[PDB]
Amino acid sequence: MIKHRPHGIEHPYAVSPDQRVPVLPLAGEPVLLGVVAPEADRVVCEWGTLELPLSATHLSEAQAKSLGADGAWSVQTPPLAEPVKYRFHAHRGGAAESTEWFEVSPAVWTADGVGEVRGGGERVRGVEWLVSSQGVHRGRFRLQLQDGDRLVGFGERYDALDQRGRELDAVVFEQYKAQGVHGRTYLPMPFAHVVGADGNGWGFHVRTSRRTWYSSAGNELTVEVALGDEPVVDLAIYEGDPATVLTGFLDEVGRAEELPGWVFRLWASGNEWNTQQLVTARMDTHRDLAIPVGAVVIEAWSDEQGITIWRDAVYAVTEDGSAHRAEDFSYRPDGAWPDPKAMIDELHARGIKVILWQIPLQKTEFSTGQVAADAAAMVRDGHAVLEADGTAYRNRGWWFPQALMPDLSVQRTRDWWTEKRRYLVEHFDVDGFKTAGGEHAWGHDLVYADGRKGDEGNNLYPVHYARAFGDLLRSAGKAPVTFSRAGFTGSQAHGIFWAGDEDSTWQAFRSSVTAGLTAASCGIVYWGWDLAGFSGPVPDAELYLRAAAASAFMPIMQYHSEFNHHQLPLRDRTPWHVAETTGDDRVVPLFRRFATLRESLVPYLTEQAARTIATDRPLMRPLFFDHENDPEIWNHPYQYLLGDELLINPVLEPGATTWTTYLPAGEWIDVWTGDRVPSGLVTRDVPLEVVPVYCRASRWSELQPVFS
Ligand SMILES: OC[C@H]1O[C@H](OC[C@H]2O[C@H](O)[C@H](O)[C@@H](O)[C@@H]2O)[C@H](O)[C@@H](O)[C@@H]1O
């Protein structure tokens, strides 16, 4: 047997051993041809009129092996001067087999074409098109920049606030940690601020959900756009100060709505709280240690099959794949969740909201049960995202492999899919969903029921996903509180976002701050991260407290911990476990101090979030919004305003006993001493109980009780 897929697995940053590299070669380029034939004596390619012998040949070694890296054949062809038809022939001991015919057409960049780039006015130059015998594959063009212009935007970015001088793209991808290092993201947008030095600033939005690439050198920003059947790039330009630029974007693509004030309290989470006993014990420790928590996320709450039913719940399976009613279920005394309603009711009585984990995937690896019935129903009734051949798409990723994706691009399947979760909101009264994932769709030719194809619709999927569960909550009369890592243009209007998975490191800390700042610049209001990281060994006391202090001054303050296989010792990120692991007796008292202060901040946050939604001036706010003509601000990219009145300067290095903050124009006050401070550089002591925070002098009469 022998297999060749020209596009391969269609990992956006990597190639599989079975594919053609590159998929679309430029004229003059050679092409590499991979093939997987685990047992064959010899493998040859019939290439045009020639015959090309294959040898035995960014994926990891574990991932590549699963795709057949062992027993993979490859050969580099002659350069592509024209379209070539080709196939492969493999022999095992005289037994012969041949692949279907494939064809590749080389492409060229040209300024000649019927294609238009519309809307850029006189800012656009150097328009060109990537064309082959198949058609126009990509547009490309240049935006004029001036000296001192910064590029801030592109959704949530982990490497730097200013993207000028960098190569990057916008595509939804799950990068498992180290997002800043690889320069990737779960939440890209083809939008950015061009932040003026000197004169009036502006911004742009490339209107597409397809892939876009970006690079800047000298005075030009180069924008490359993937295309569909129509060779047209629609470009929107927004003129004004940074807030006004954001307004133009958000007026076009959507905007946050006010969420309930309780989302501004501390969120407690850990993945290994997989029983009612554990959740209640963890929240009890919160109560007993007097550490206020406003919400608890339960990730492993479910049967781990369909992920819409409590673990060890007893019910009659519905063969038709219809949704369950609350009364369908029984909960046994000896099960993992003997009385989930009683648990939630008690939590609610304590003022704690309850959030359940979600994934937009239906496991196919079971032949029985509700999970199998629903999977069969998805295919039968057309609720699944489809391949080009009409079969159901199966997850090509390594996380939840082969699972189906519900097609959330249309209302009927959004209804059908969320209907399975309805009893959770209406009976059990859960207050939100942590809607994880959504990046799972890989293929250019995938078909969505809304008429979009994969190259267009795959980036849109996480937006549909958050909206689906936001709508479920609305339909139950509750605020649309969803908690999502993934998104795209339009995500601004659905729920809360966190920065995804990272190790516990100072680098990840710094990356996360950048992620929040860039996200806010694009209109993402309610944002957080897993403070001091959720993955690997427990953070040390210093990193934990530096992160905890700063996060209390961020839109969403939440701690979380990755699945450890239920080993001992625990990897929990709870304050008392950190104290336990580090042996540091300052962790619980100082975290309690931060959490207690955070509670006092809720009315301020609530008011500021309302201003942010009305004026589009960001909640976690880079200084260029108010201060754009101040050149000095760019030397302190980790500083920000929290709402109008508070400037925050996180301590991002270990061992720091002092910290220096740049205060822009206006009068300021040190919130810890109540003293007045002159604008410009300011240095103050930073013991672990302090993160530098300054208040506009005119409103310190309002903020003073908070810090008293
Ligand atoms: O038991 C529920 C769930 O736990 C893990 O998923 C948790 C993980 O989900 C995403 O990676 C989020 O970004 C993280 O914050 C969460 O900790 C397991 O991997 C999964 O199989 C399981 O169903």
UniProtKB/Swiss-Prot annotation:
Pfam families in the record: AIMA-like_N, Gal_mutarotas_2, Glyco_hydro_31_2nd, Glyco_hydro_31_3rd
Coiled-coil annotated residue ranges, if any: none
Binding site for substrate: 566
InterPro entries: AIMA-like_N, Gal_mutarotase_sf_dom, Glyco_hydro_31_C, Glyco_hydro_31_N_dom, Glyco_hydro_31_TIM, Glyco_hydro_b, Glycoside_hydrolase_SF, Glycosyl_Hydrolase_31
GO cellular component: cytoplasm
EC number, as in UniProt: 3.2.1.204
Compartments it resides in: Cytoplasm
One GO BP: polysaccharide catabolic process
Known catalytic reactions: cyclobis-(1->3)-alpha-D-isomaltosyl + 2 H2O = 2 isomaltose
One function term, GO molecular function aspect: hydrolase activity, hydrolyzing O-glycosyl compounds
Active site residues per record: 436 (nucleophile), 439, 501 (proton donor)
pH dependence as annotated: Optimum pH is 7.9.
Top-tier EC class: hydrolase
Similarity remark: Belongs to the glycosyl hydrolase 31 family.
Function, as annotated: Involved in the intracellular degradation of the cyclic tetrasaccharide cyclobis-(1-6)-alpha-nigerosyl (CNN) formed extracellularly from starch. Catalyzes the hydrolysis of the alpha-1,3-glucosidic linkage of cyclobis-(1-6)-alpha-nigerosyl (CNN) to yield isomaltose via a possible linear tetrasaccharide. It has a strong preference for the alpha-(1-3)-isomaltosyl moiety.
Name of the protein this chain belongs to: 1,3-alpha-isomaltosidase
Organism of this sequence: Kribbella flavida (strain DSM 17836 / JCM 10339 / NBRC 14399)
The organism's taxonomic lineage, starting at the top: Bacteria, Bacillati, Actinomycetota, Actinomycetes, Propionibacteriales
